[PDB]
Each structure stands twice: as C-alpha cells, then as structure tokens.
Amino acid sequence: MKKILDSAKNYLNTHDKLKTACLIALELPSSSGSAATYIYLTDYFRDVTYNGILYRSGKVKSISSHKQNRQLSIGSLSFTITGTAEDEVLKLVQNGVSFLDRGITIHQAIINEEGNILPVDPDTDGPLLFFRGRITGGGIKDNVNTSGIGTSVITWNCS
Amino acid sequence: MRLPDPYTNPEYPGLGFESVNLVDNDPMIRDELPNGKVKEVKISAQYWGINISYPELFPDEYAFLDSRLLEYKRTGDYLDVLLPQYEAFRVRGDTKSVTIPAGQKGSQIILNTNGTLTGQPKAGDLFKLSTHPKVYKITNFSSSGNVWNISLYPDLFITTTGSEKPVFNGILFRTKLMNGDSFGSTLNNNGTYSGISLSLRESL
Amino acid sequence: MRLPDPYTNPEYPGLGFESVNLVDNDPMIRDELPNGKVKEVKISAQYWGINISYPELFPDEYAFLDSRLLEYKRTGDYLDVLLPQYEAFRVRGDTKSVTIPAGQKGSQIILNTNGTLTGQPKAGDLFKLSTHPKVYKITNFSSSGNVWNISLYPDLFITTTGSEKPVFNGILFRTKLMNGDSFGSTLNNNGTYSGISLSLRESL
Amino acid sequence: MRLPDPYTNPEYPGLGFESVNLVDNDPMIRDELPNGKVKEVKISAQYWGINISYPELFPDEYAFLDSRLLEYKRTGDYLDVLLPQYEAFRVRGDTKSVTIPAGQKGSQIILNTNGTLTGQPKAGDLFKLSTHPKVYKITNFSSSGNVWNISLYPDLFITTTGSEKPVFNGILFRTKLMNGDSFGSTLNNNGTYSGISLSLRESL
Amino acid sequence: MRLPDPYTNPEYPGLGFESVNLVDNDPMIRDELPNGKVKEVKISAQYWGINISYPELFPDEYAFLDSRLLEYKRTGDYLDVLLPQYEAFRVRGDTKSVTIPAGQKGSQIILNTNGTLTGQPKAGDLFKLSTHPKVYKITNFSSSGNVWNISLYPDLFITTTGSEKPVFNGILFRTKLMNGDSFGSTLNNNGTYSGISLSLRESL
Amino acid sequence: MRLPDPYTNPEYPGLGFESVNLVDNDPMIRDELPNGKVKEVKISAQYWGINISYPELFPDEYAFLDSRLLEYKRTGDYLDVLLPQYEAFRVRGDTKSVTIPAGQKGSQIILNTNGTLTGQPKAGDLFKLSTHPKVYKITNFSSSGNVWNISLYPDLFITTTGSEKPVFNGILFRTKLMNGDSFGSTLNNNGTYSGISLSLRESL
Amino acid sequence: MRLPDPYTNPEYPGLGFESVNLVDNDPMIRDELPNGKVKEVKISAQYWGINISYPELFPDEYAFLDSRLLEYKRTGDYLDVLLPQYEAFRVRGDTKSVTIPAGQKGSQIILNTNGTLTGQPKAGDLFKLSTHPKVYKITNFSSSGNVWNISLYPDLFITTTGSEKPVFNGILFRTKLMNGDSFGSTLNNNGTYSGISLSLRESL
Amino acid sequence: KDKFFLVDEVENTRDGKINLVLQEYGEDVFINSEQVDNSGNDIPDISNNVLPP
Secondary structure, three states: OOOOOHHHHHHHHHOOEEEEEEEEEEEEOOOOOOOOEEEEEEOOOOOEEEOOEEEEOOOEEEEOOEEEEOOOOOOOEEEEEEOOOHHHHHHHHHHOOOOOOOEEEEEEEEEOOOOOEOOOEOOOOEOEEEEEEEEEEEEEEEEOOOOOEOEEEEEEEEO | OEOOOOOOOOOOOOOOOOEEEEEEEOOEEEEEOOOOOEEEEOOOOOEEEEEEEOOOEOHHHHHHHHHHHHHHHHHOOOEEEOOOOOOOOOOEOOOOOOEOOOOOOOOEEEEEOOOOOEOOOOOOOEEEEOOOOOEEEEEEEEEEOOEEEEEEOOOOOOOOOOOOOEEOOOOOEEEEEOOOOEEEEEEOOOOOEEOOEEEEEEOO | OEOOOOOOOOOOHHHOOOEEEEEEEOOOEEEEOOOOOEEEEOOOOOEEEEEEEOOOEOHHHHHHHHHHHHHHHHHOOOEEEOOHHHOOOOOEEOOOOOEOOOOOOOOEEEEEOOOOEEOOOOOOOEEEEOOOOOEEEEEEEEEEOOEEEEEEOOOOOOOOOOOOOEEOOOOOEEEEEOOOOEEOOEEOOOOOEEOOEEEEEEOO | OEOOOOOOOOOOOOOOOOEEEEEEEOOOEEEEOOOOOEEEEOOOOOEEEEEEEOOOEOHHHHHHHHHHHHHHHHHOOOEEEOOOOOOOOOOEOOOOOOEOOOOOOOOEEEEEOOOOOEOOOOOOOEEEEOOOOOEEEEEEEEEEOOEEEEEEOOOOOOOOOOOOOEEOOOOOEEEEEOOOOEEEEEEOOOOOEEOOEEEEEEOO | OEOOOOOOOOOOHHHOOOEEEEEEEOOOEEEEOOOOOEEEEOOOOOEEEEEEEOOOEOHHHHHHHHHHHHHHHHHOOOEEEOOHHHOOOOOEEOOOOOEOOOOOOOOEEEEEOOOOEEOOOOOOOEEEEOOOOOEEEEEEEEEEOOEEEEEEOOOOOOOOOOOOOEEOOOOOEEEEEOOOOEEOOEEOOOOOEEOOEEEEEEOO | OEOOOOOOOOOOOOOOOOEEEEEEEOOOEEEEOOOOOEEEEOOOOOEEEEEEEOOOEOHHHHHHHHHHHHHHHHHOOOEEEOOOOOOOOOOEOOOOOOEOOOOOOOOEEEEEOOOOOEOOOOOOOEEEEOOOOOEEEEEEEEEEOOEEEEEEOOOOOOOOOOOOOEEOOOOOEEEEEOOOOEEEEEEOOOOOEEOOEEEEEEOO | OEOOOOOOOOOOHHHOOOEEEEEEEOOOEEEEOOOOOEEEEOOOOOEEEEEEEOOOEOHHHHHHHHHHHHHHHHHOOOEEEOOHHHOOOOOEEOOOOOEOOOOOOOOEEEEEOOOOEEOOOOOOOEEEEOOOOOEEEEEEEEEEOOEEEEEEOOOOOOOOOOOOOEEOOOOOEEEEEOOOOEEOOEEOOOOOEEOOEEEEEEOO | OOOOOEEEEEEEOOOOOEEEEEEOOOOOOOOOOOOOOOOOOOOOOOOOOOOOO
C-alpha cells in the first residue's frame, strides 16, 4: 500500500471540507518529433500553478473512476470536455484521430486553506497521482432541441 | 390565411385577444463551466410564440372562428395573425421606393428611404422583410438623413438580395397551431363558449 | 338509440346538458426541425368527442337515464346525441332530388341542388351524408348557380358512389359511451343522485 | 352474513348509509380502430361495486359494526348488504308458484307467474335468481297477461334449469370487503367515530 | 412502561389523546380472477396500529412527555397505551379460578368460568390472555351455562397450554413507537411546543 | 465558532430563533417480523438536528448574520449554537472540582460533586462532557447525598477517562449547515429579509 | 451593459426591483458517514444568483425594458445589476495608490492602504478587485495600521499579480440572463404587461 | 474482530469515495503462512440419524 506523508494524514483527518482538484497534463500532437507541446487543464474553479506549470480551469467538466483488481487488464478512464468551447470541438472533430496514443497524466491535488497544494505524495512532496496512460478515441454528441436548452459534450477515452 | 379579428370582421367584437403572450424562443447550447463562466452557442433557429386567449364567445362568433380554424386544418396552409399592440402606425408612406442594398447578413441592416418615409421607428417595434416571412424586433435605431440603420434582435435569416422591401406596418406572423390535436370548446348554460385559447407558434 | 334530452323527454328537466364539450380529436405526428420549420403527419382518423355534464338528479330522472344507459349497454347499440346549438334550419326542401357526383374522395363535396333546396348552408354548420354516420362541419361554401361547393373539415371518410344524399338538419352523433367500464353515481342522503358524467366518442 | 343496518337493528340509527355509490364494473377489451370504429369485446365477468359511507357513529354503534365486520373477517364468509333505495316493494305476492322455463341464456328471460304476482316491476329495479347470487338490473319490461318478459343488463350467468325462482324483493349483494387490509377508525374529542366508509365489491 | 395519560397524570391535561386511530393492519394477498371471484391469501400476522395526536404543549407537559419517551428509547422498553373507550367493566371477579382447556389454536376460546365471574362480555370489547401480550377483540359470545364461547378476530397467536387466564379489564397495548427515527417537536415563540404525533404499532 | 444570537449580540434583537425544531435522528435497522414482533438494531450514530427559523431581519442584522455564516463557510470549522429554552440555570457552582470516575460506558453515568454543586438537574435538561462535543439529554436523575446518578438518552460515545468534567450550563451544539449549497435571501419592498431559516445538523 | 433601474431611469418607476433574491450557489459533495461525521468536498465554483421580480408594467416601461433585454440578447453582452442595499459608502478616497502584494491565492486579501483611504469596510459588505469581475463579500476585517486584512467568502478566483486595485463602491454583478430560452410577457386587456421575471446568474 | 481480509478491487472516484471489494480466505492457506495444520486428526463421523423399531 502507498503510504502518504504524515501531514497529509493529519490534514485529511482534521479537515472535513476538502477542495480537491484534478490536474490534467494532456499531450498535444506534433507533425514532427522536433516539437513537444502539452495542454494543461483542471476542473478547479481557478488556475492552479503546480511545479511552475499553469493548469487552466475553463474546460474540463467531469472525470470517470479509475478501477483495478488483482488480474492484469487494461483499465480505462474517460473524462468529458465542454462542447461549447471552440478550441476543443475543432480539435476533436478535425484531429480526433491523430490524438490516438497520446499521453495524459491526471493528478488528484488537495488545495490547502490557502491556494497552495497539500503535499500528499512523499516521493515528490506533491499531489498523489491519479491516472496515467494513452488516449484511445474520442467523441462529441451535439444535442439541440427546438424548445429548451441544448447540449454539447466532448467525451475523451483513455487507457 | 388570416386569423379573424375585429379589424377584419368588425361585426364580431367577441373575437379579439383578451390577452396575448408573445414569448421569445431561442434554443441555445448553454454550458455552465466549472470556473463560473457561462458559454452558450446559438444553433437552432429562433421563433416567436403567440399565446392568444379569447373572451366569452357567443355561438355565432365561435362558429365563425372555428370555421376559419377548421379551414386552416383542412387546406393545411399557414395561419397569419396581426398583433394589435404593435399596430401603432408610426411610419407613414409607401415603401416600394425604399431600397435595401444587397449583401447584408447579421443583426444590422441599412436601408435607403430616398426621402420617402415620414416617421421614426422607435425601439421595440416590429420589422419584417417583404420576401421572407420572418418577423424581427427593432432594438436600436439611428438615422443619418435619409439612410436608416436598424438593429434587429434575430439575425437576418436570409442575406438581402437588393430587392427586399421594408414592411413597417401590417406585419403578420406566419404561425402554426399547437392545440389542434385536442381542441375542445365548452358551452355554458348561459349561452357562451368560455375559455377559448390558442397556442400559436411561428413556422420558419 | 337516442340519448334522453329535454326535447323528447321534457318531463325530466334534469336530463338536460348542463355543459357540452365538443372535442376535436385529430391525432397527428408533429415534428419541429431545428431550422424553425414545424412539420406534421396525419394517418389516423378524426373523431368528435362529446362530454356531457349533469346536475343533481331526482330518483325518477336518474331511473329513466339509467334504464336507457343499461339498455344501450345491453343491446350494444349506438347512442345518438343531439346538440341544440347546431339545430339552426337554413337549408329546407327535399334531399332526394339532389345529386352528388361520384368519385369524390377529397375534403370537398360538389353537389347539384337541382334548384330543389331553398336557403344556403352557413360556414361552421354541421353536415352529414345519408349513407355514412360520420359528422362533418362546413368550413366554406360557395354557390355558383345550382351547384354547391361545400368544404368539410374531416377528409371524406367514404368515396361518394353517386347515391348519397346530403343531410343538413336533424343530424345526430353516432357516439359510443366511453368510461363505461367503471360507471357509477353516488346517492346522497337527501335522495338526489350526483356525480353523473357521460364521456362519449363518435364511433362511426 | 348480513351487514348491520337500521332495518335489522333499529336500535342503532347511526348505522345506515349516508351515501351509497353503486358503480358498474364491466371489464372489456376495447380497441380504437384507425378508421374511427370502436370495437369492444366482453370477456371478464361483470360485478357491481358498492361504496358505503357512514355518518357520525357513536361508540356503541361502531362497536356493533366493527364486531360484525371482524366476525366477517374471521369466519371468512361473504357479507350481504341490502341497498334501501331499491327496496320499493313494487311486487306483492309469493314467488314459489312462479316457474321459469329451463334452457334460457342471455339478457332476456321469460317467467310465468301463473296469476300469482300483483304489481309491475318497472325498469331500473333489481332482480336476482333464487339459486345464483348474481344481482341483475331490469332494463325493460313487457308482459302479455301472466307471462312476463324481462330484460336484464348483465347476461344470465347460469342457464335457467327450470327451478330458479324470481326474487323481486329483499335482494342482497354477496360482496367482499376491499378496505380490510388497512381499516382505521378515528375517535374525536366530541365522542364519535368520523369518516367510517366501506368499499365493497360483489364476489362472483 | 405506560404512556402518560390523564388517568395517571391529570396535572398535565395536554397529555390527553386528542384523537386516537385504531388501525386494523392485516396484510393479505388479494387476487381477482376474471370470472368475478375474488380470492384472498393470509400469511403474515395482524397488528393493531395506534396513532396519537396531541394539542399545543406547555413546557412542563412536553418536558414530562419527552422524558418518558427518552426513557423508552433508552431502556428499549415497550410503551403501554390505554384507550378509555374500551374500559367498560362488564366481567368482574377472579380470573384465577377460571380454566381454559389446552390445545386451542383456532380463532375461538372455550373457557369454563366455574361460576366465579359475574356479568358477560359484549361483542366488540377487548380481550387478552394473561400469558401473551397480543390484544383480541370479541366478535361473538355465546354462554351455555358456565362454559363461555368467545370468538376473537386475530387467530390465536399462541396455543393454549391450560395455564392461561382471560383478562377482560385493564388491557394495555404492548406497542413500540414507530417514526422514532426522525422524532421532533418545534417550539414556537410563544413558549408552547407544537407538532407532536405518536405513531405506535403493537409489537407483541 | 459561535452562531450570533441576542445573548452574544444584544444590539441585534432581530437575531434569535422565531421557532427552533430539535429533532431526534437515530438511524436503526428496524425489521418487522411476520409473527408481529418488531426487531430494531442500533448501529449508526445518533445526532441531534436543529431547524432554526428567523423573524423579519433588517438589512444590518442580516448583514451581520450572513457575514458570520460566510465566515463559517470560508474557514470550514464547526458552527456552535446555544438553544435558549435549555438555558435554565438550574445548577449553580463551578464543576472543575467534580470528578467522574473512569471506565464508564452506556447510558448510566456516576459523578461525584464532592459537595460543590447546588441545584438538581431535572429530567429533560441537557448534558455535555467537557472533552467530547456530543450533547446528551437527561432522562432520569437519582442522587444519594453528593454522588449523582444520571441516565442519558444517547449512550456515552466515549468511555470516561476520569478527567471529563460535567457541563450543566452553556451547552453548545457542534453543528454543520445543511442549507449551504443553495441559500438565498429575499429583500421586500418593506425593507426586511423575510423567511430566513437554517437546517443545522450536529456533526459527530 | 447596465440593467435599467430607477437610479439611471427614474421616469420608469415600474422598472424598480420589487424583490431581489441573492442566492448563494456553491455546489458541494456532502457525505454523511454512519459514525455521525458529516464530510464535504468542494470542486466547482461559487456564483451569485440574482432573481428579479417586477410589478405590472405600462407600455412605455415594458418597451424600454424589452429593448434593453433584446439589445443584450443581440450583442451577447453582460447585464450589470446594482443592488441598492449594498451601496453604503464607507471607504472613500483613491484606490490607485493602494498596493496589493502579489501571490495571494487563498481566501484573504492583505493590502497596504498607504493611508490614502478614509473609513473602514464593514463585515458583510461587497468587495471586488479591479481586474476580475467576480464579486466578493467581506466576512471579516482587521486593520493593523495601514495594512488591511480583508477576508472574502469565495476563494480568490485569481492570483493577485500586484496590479489589482480594490473596489468598494459602485460594484456591479456581471450577470448573464438565464431563462432567456423561453422568455415572454403576457399583455392583459387593460394595457399593462404582467408576468415578467429575470433569473440572472453571475457569469464571471 | 479484526478479521483478516485481502483487497481484490479498489476503485478511486473524483469525489473521494473509494469502492472496495475484499476477499475472505480459509485459515493458514497463504504461501507466507505456516501451512502446517494439526486439527484434522478427528475424522468426521457418518450421519446415520435413523433407527429401527
């Protein structure tokens, strides 16, 4: 079992209100190997500057659950993106196949009473890693109705 | 066709809206971002909705009204209505000699009266192009002599082709009934049809 | 079989229709496209729905009405319902010398009155053919000499064979009593029966 | 067994129906054809439903009533009731010498009084055969001297065997309680049980 | 443990039962066949449900009642409820010299009073055995000499061992307080507690 | 932190409970056996629930109140409240010299005042240990000289360690808000915030 | 864009806010463990919800309000809403010579007023930064010389860059009109518009 | 009382709720445990619970 820093356990026991944030560092496709770019996202309500990396907060809506058991198998995780964003709708629609097999690193970060991140993981004194792997496909579902409020959700799939 | 009303048929004063509800129906892909920002995308077309309520209708007036409505249901055409609160004739003149330069899309519109119209269309009044049956709503007005700059709430559905003529008076909504499937009328012992109401809805 | 009304049976004044409800039931499949155009599809038939309400009933009035309703439910006949507001006599004469050309399957009857009928039918009246029990409402009427052009709301349920004769007066709805599965009436301690309602449907 | 009422127990005038609802329950396979024709098939048996409402019951009257009802629930037999509005003794005489010829099924029935009965059973009155416990309702009557032709709303459940005797008076419904599972009685500070009601239902 | 009532505690008149509700709870599986025969099946037990309502309570009355209820919830005891309307003293004497033959498991108690008891129990009264807490209602009673034939609504929850002694007076319901999971009472600004209700169930 | 009230802030008399609902919330595994016996198992911890209703609050009083509530929501600590109906100072003295012998679990508790306290805590009053924040309710009291035997409705959450001191006055509930997610306040044209209410809930 | 209020437009007194509803919307995931400890988790942002109600509107007042709302829906701007009850002027002076140290991302602003501001902000007032549109409420304020310690309910939506300037007076809510998908107003026969409600949400 | 179980499926959600599926095993059946069992000498007996007249 992965032990966590002592102060982490003390904060988790003492504080009943936890302001968690999921920090996503998604790999961005490049035509040639000479380029390497990442897009950083979070579901928190403000940008989180973690290790000098600015995790913007506008887009990510929800994240699925990570599950594993005693038998080796390729676990999967899917997170949703707001389909009203023009950047991501364009990216998924017109580049959603070139995104295959591109990495992603999701961190589960507790935000202190101040904006600092509670150092739970003792190996890096940072957040506790939540997921890591590669994308496998995507999907957008535009859903409008002539009466009411429509919907547009971008769903990514990962392994 | 025309929905009967005291203007077309003054002999039936029972016709006429006891209360009219002009609703705005713009579907939108609204999304509430986790950061507090609300993003909404307009894709589906907007359409005015008209809810008409009638006063106590006597048997002959209701006979005329439901005869016209059943003719509507039979021939299957559209049903035009004229809202009277927007019938303030604030613009005199004949609009045939008014040119709208071609190649205009969006809310803004520019039309040249060529010194023909008399009267200023204030904000909140209706507006309709000669060709397309859509009905807009003036939100702001600004004129420099003869040229008029009008801003309309719904974006111009069709780009002006240089021949569309403004219609500042007698604007009719090309609507369709939404109560047709189950439309009943009750007759009281007093001799009047009570609670007659229509849920219209602009088509296209 | 005729439903008891204060025309045939005035000795029971409680059998009058306190309030009738002529319901227009024409089921349609209505779909609203995002481009603002509402589209309808009609397959099933249109049937006139009649709802009758009654006041407190004395024992004799209720006895007569219940005997008639039980006779209906026993023989499985068809209740005929007469609406007084639709009994205005305009067209008078013989309907046997009038001829209806055959092959008319649309929503319009063209008939040569042969000058044997006086008066003219009014829009919104009730019209019915002599060989079919379905009841029609005249939505429009144009007379050019002896040939009449009567327009009907429900599309002609039969194709005219040339032997049908128009019926303008004395029209009855060949209804079948709905809500008869659980039909009852509570008798109060004061001797009068209350809570009697007839939901009738035109079973042509 | 017999449901207590002021006729059986005059010392308890609180018993007795404040209001009785005699509902008609004929299940039917009704189908609404697309052409407008309504087709209904009768398969399940019909059963009268009786809803009895009691006035303010004093403690002793309610003690008697619920004692009788609990005896019903204990021994498990049927619970007979006598509706008083149908207790108009319109037929005098003894019906033992009245023969009903065997081999009769359907609504119609023929019985020979042999010049014994005095009084004519008018439409709307009740009727019950001596053997079977079903309760019918006379819908039409026609007599030619001694022979009586009676039409009953529910078809004869069993074909007459030539020994069944008519019962024109003292007709009891063989019913079963439908409120037994949760039957509560409230006692006020005034000293009366309020809102006592029964939902009976004829069995077989 | 006894629920506080104005018998033991008259100094708190607000603790009286403003309205009691003796609910007959006997769950049964009732099935109605299409042939008109309604059929029931009984497996589970019958339990008397008691609902108590209270008026506005002063601080001392509420303090006493709440202390008693919290004592109940602390020791997990059984609240005993006394209904005044069932406290008519008919049978008087010693219940120790009366003998009940053993092996009686039906819905009927045959007991030899041995001439030691005066008076006779009335139908609809409350009856209880001395060795079981379940409460019975007498539905019928026939006395032939000294042997009594008492009929009870709930089927005997125990088989008589010959040592049981009938109890006619001073009968209490061994109830358990339901709705105690979320039990509260709002205190108004005028100092009185309101909204207090006891939903009790007979937990034998 | 402390919830503002007229005791802490007398300058704001608008604060203060118009009505307080002290509900009892003990979850239980209740099971209704087929034989009539009701079996309930207590596993989940019990917690008092407090529903506070405020009178018409003027803008400054509501500013103070919602400032304190938003400070609560910000720093995330617990929100203490003091019910005033249980503030009857029935026990004088200082409780530091009162010893509670260690090793006590369950409802019962034994504490030795050593001849220090003056006043008897009657049943229904509150009780709270110095260390643990749980709030109990005295259900019965019995004293033999200086030693006091107190029975509490909720079982002692923690076993006494010999240092816990009794707190018979100034008992605060360590609660958490349950209306925080959607908490709105309406301002009338009269100038007062109306219908301000809180649904508190004791934590741990 | 500013919502019309009787500050800028007193000629339309019907445009005043008959009743405002400042809704605190802070969605949280609240879980109650069986051990009595309630636990909360906060991820999403907090947004101030404003609900406006209006009285009957004359044609000119409704024309102005509808023109402004249609201008909003045309340009897609942000409605600014001013609450009079939050317009108490306490802090006066220049907010340009005050400095806010950077790197403050918690729920607390430490600023050096540099002696340029007179007065002190009161708890429960409205506070806002000059570079972000989110509106904050002061939950606590401690002044130690020129440095102020302002505590805010919503956690700082931005990290201070050192160039932000506090804003205490003239604060507007950068709202976006919800319920605009189906927005309408019924015109009564007496000429006044009724049923107008603005559900606004703070779209920062 | 401190019964020994083994985790088999842990699921982590974004709300923090952690779903577990443990797995119970026999006694001293693990590779690490001392597998020697001395309690099996007493063989169970036959169930002849019926007798003649």
